[PDB]
Design a protein around this ligand. Structure first.
Ligand SMILES: Nc1ncnc2c1ncn2[C@@H]1O[C@H](COP(=O)(O)OP(=O)(O)O)[C@@H](O)[C@H]1O
Ligand SMILES: Nc1ncnc2c1ncn2[C@@H]1O[C@H](COP(=O)(O)OP(=O)(O)O)[C@@H](O)[C@H]1O
Ligand code: BEF
Ligand code: BEF
Ligand SMILES: [Mg+2]
Ligand SMILES: [Mg+2]
Lengths: 271, 361, 361
């Protein structure tokens, strides 16, 4: 129904972690903005901020780059260090980080804030004189009084069953049905066969009424007590229908989840 | 953007920086376990460092960089002897007590129970016996005699007015308080937090005092918190609850490597419950200072209502000179035979005349 | 159609408006959780407003619109300092006592234990010692001296005829009672209801006066209610039961932002039961006043049968001037050495001649 890798990617996102949002990852990634594809957050980070490539500087060794010096992909940030992607190499006390971005020195007040993602033409500083002609996040470094628009433009993130149910709610069926009608009646079998394969469930839902918005599970009813009986065998031992053995674990699961959401967000832990 | 606090390490290897309220606060700063590992940092250590506003989906700001740990550069944090490894010894350096509004109280303390640095002390009195007022006097006298030492006042399960009066009367010294309106969990949490901060300070060779009102109420919280332990001590005390107060008080010690933790705390007795008396006798074997106040002396409005005969230190010779030691020995010999109230009234009369050195003269 | 009551918020986020009996009633008015959210209403808040007859399938009348909360317009409820956030201090506003039918009691109280606004007091006496009659005298004196102070009389687990007598003799001040015919649960429920009403009133800067007979019986009900706590305190009291009564009593306090909560309650002692004595000693460390009545003085039929030496307040200087402070000090010094009954006799003979202020002269 969701035009998905129903077998692999489905559980891939349900259990492993993958950012997904439809609106716009407008900024480039080797391929232009993606619309609904799922990504690994490593590349979504590297994108998130242009391209920062930080390399240590040997102690007592001064770098061959300047603090606000443009460093290209492969340039030696130091006698031994070699950059790996273009941008501006900034100093660290100790190291050099070349962040893929376009630089705009400011001698007046800065107009963009480090963090804001600015379009080509948008003012970065000094009013209209310091402007951003590059999409992406901005770093206003007073270290050399510049505003660097990294190419990293506004690309957000989503994950897991919540995004799953969102896409669920994010879909209106008759649109898909008309599209699938096109995809069968016009096209050849190879693809239109699967088009109708999904169109059949689409018909089931549409003519059936009830929304799939509850297609997933969030309020699990709890069996009536005797239905999973606990019978006293003898002398104190208890024979319990295994449902409770799982109910208990579920409760513990949910409980610690609540605790950590109240306590702290170790994202690896949380996942 | 700069942030500061005292480290609370979570079970998960990351920590938070707290405020003076010593509780989880919205403004606490996250600290990654990585940083803790570089700086070998510990709970209660005071951390100052530049921070950044939390990113999207972050509920707490993140310390971008560590600037100072315990008011010093982080390097020494990696290389330093560990508090529990510090040598526990006697207080070998006296602190003279003098406070202008009542020099007589500090006076009788010095002539009965002198205070060294690293002191594991206790004052024992029934309710309404100058105990809390006496602690106020010691606080002020410390803040006049030993301004260099980090003076910390702790108020547990006690009266709110006392809290405020000490906030105004402590003149800005770090006081952490938790009135009786708070549950024992709050009390135990705050007490352990301040405890660990103090141990971290002394780890750097610093001098600290904990003025702990109501150590017995803290023991009450420990009893209420200890989950079972099985058997119960006579008087209603739990056996394993008192392990924590015993360790807590035993923390006070003299260090041969610099700094020391002194803890002076207020004890309740003659309260009609075996529980208070058992706590008293249990702490008495760990402490080096007992100073007894008599309820009958308070009833006569004779202050300070100190029970001279029961009061004393342990190892006066390490804290007093031969002349002072023999002066006080002569004094006590004179004073063993007299009755409590009479002894105090006469002592106040003799001491109201002149300085104590001039009193000896 | 108009209804009125005191708000009681259920676990479900909606509440009911109660009657003077302080329990669920058929005519209670439903209050949607919404109204509570818009107006920030809180348990015990007094709500008056138009209501409508319940629709079909509805069993209780619903509040169509709110008009006034705690006798004032609802807007202030949205923005007000919460009672828990109010600064607790000492009662700085003494209340003189005088009741015409027996002003000996009022003057002896003033000369033994002055009263302020925000008072946390207690009267301690064995059974049949004028504690109940004393409470009646104080009630009448307050209803003559401080009409501005909201006087609520709470009677827990006590004699029904006494309830009738006080209801008739309280000249209309709110008398809430729950006799010993009620189970401990009714007592406790009326307890939180009245208490929350009082704190909500004080939240608005009001002065509330609570006269609670049988605080010890309330503690007994709490103990009967505490589900296990595990172990039992010395005497058969529960370790965690007294937390609630302690919180109740410690709620009494003086507010620097206006208003005060003054609770005076009756305590039983010398009952031959360890529960009562432990409760008393537990509450003494929380209250600012003890006033002791002697069973032997009652046996001789001497009233008020007060044990002067044990009685007194704390911080009398904040409720009395220097002249009155030194006068009371002189009077206690004179009376400190005298036998209870005979001391009370001379005090009565000295106060019988004339009023206390001219007794000074
Ligand atoms: N040195 C003193 N001078 C004047 N009043 C005192 C003195 N010591 C105690 N008091 C009186 O004792 C009362 C409370 O005693 P406190 O020390 O708080 O109780 P405890 O000793 O049990 O902690 C105060 O109201 C105060 O008036
Ligand atoms: N001031 C008084 N004048 C006359 N009788 C008194 C006085 N105080 C106590 N009594 C007597 O003591 C008995 C009970 O005392 P009271 O305080 O009313 O109840 P309680 O038994 O709780 O003390 C009453 O029957 C009453 O006659
Ligand atoms: F101040 Be005491 F401990 F009542
Ligand atoms: F005799 Be009393 F009512 F306790
Ligand atoms: Mg005290
Ligand atoms: Mg009675």
């Amino acid at each position: 129904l969701l035009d998905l890798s129903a077998t692999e990617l489905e559980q891939v996102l349900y259990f492993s972690k993958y950012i997904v949002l439809d609106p716009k990852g407008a900024i480039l990634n080797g391929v232009p903005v993606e619309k609904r594809q799922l990504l690994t957050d490593e590349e979504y980070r590297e994108l998130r901020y242009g391209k920062q490539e930080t390399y240590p500087l040997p102690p007592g060794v001064d770098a061959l780059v300047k603090d606000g010096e443009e460093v290209v992909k492969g340039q030696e940030l130091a006698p031994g260090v070699v950059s790996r992607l273009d941008g501006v190499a900034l100093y660290r006390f100790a190291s050099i980080l070349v962040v893929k971005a376009r630089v705009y020195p400011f001698e007046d007040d800065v107009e963009v804030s480090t963090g804001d993602r600015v379009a080509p033409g948008d003012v970065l500083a000094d009013g209209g004189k310091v402007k951003s002609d590059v999409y992406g996040r901005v770093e206003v470094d007073l270290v050399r009084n510049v505003v660097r628009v990294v190419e990293s433009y506004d690309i957000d993130a989503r994950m897991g069953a919540e995004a799953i149910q969102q896409l669920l709610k994010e879909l209106d069926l008759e649109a898909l049905e008309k599209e699938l009608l096109e995809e069968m009646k016009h096209p050849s079998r190879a693809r239109r066969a699967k088009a109708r394969k999904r169109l059949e469930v689409v018909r089931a839902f549409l003519d059936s009424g009830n929304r799939p918005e509850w297609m997933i599970l969030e309020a699990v009813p709890v069996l009536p007590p005797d239905l999973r009986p606990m019978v006293q065998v003898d002398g104190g031992r208890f024979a319990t229908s295994d449902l409770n053995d799982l109910y208990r674990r579920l409760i513990n699961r949910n409980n610690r989840l609540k605790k950590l959401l109240a306590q702290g967000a170790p994202e690896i832990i949380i996942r | 953007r700069l942030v500061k606090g005292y480290l609370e390490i979570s079970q998960d290897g990351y920590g938070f920086l707290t405020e003076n309220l010593h509780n989880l606060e919205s403004r606490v700063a996250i600290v990654s376990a990585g940083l803790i590992k570089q700086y070998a940092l510990r709970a209660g250590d005071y951390v100052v460092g530049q921070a950044r506003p939390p990113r999207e989906n972050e509920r707490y700001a993140t310390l971008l960089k560590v600037e100072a740990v315990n008011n010093l550069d982080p390097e020494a944090a990696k290389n330093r002897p560990r508090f529990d490894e510090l040598t526990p010894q006697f207080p070998d350096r006296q602190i003279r007590l003098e406070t202008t509004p009542d020099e007589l109280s500090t006076r009788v303390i010095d002539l009965l129970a002198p205070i060294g640095r690293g002191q594991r002390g206790l004052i024992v009195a029934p309710p309404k016996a100058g105990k809390t007022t006496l602690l106020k006097k010691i606080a002020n006298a410390v803040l006049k005699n030993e301004p260099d030492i980090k003076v910390i006042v702790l108020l547990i399960d006690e009266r709110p007015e006392e809290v405020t009066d000490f906030r105004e009367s402590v003149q800005g010294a770090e006081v952490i308080a938790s009135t009786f309106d708070e549950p024992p969990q709050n009390h135990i949490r705050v007490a352990e937090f301040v405890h660990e901060r103090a141990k971290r300070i002394v780890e750097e060779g610093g001098h600290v005092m904990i003025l702990l009102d109501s150590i017995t109420r803290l023991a009450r919280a420990n009893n209420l918190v200890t989950p079972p332990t099985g058997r119960t001590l006579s008087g209603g005390l739990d056996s394993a609850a008192l392990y924590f107060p015993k360790r807590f008080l035993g923390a006070a010690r003299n260090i041969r490597g610099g700094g020391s933790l002194t803890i002076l705390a207020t004890a309740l007795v003659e309260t009609g419950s075996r529980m208070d008396d058992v706590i008293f006798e249990e702490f008495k074997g760990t402490g080096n200072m007992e100073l007894h106040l008599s309820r009958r002396l308070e009833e006569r409005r004779i202050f300070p209502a100190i029970d001279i005969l029961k009061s004393g230190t342990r190892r006066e010779e390490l804290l007093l000179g031969e002349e002072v030691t023999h002066k006080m020995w002569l004094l006590r010999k004179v004073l063993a035979d007299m009755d409590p109230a009479e002894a105090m009234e006469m002592l106040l009369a003799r001491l109201a005349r002149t300085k104590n050195n001039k009193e000896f003269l």
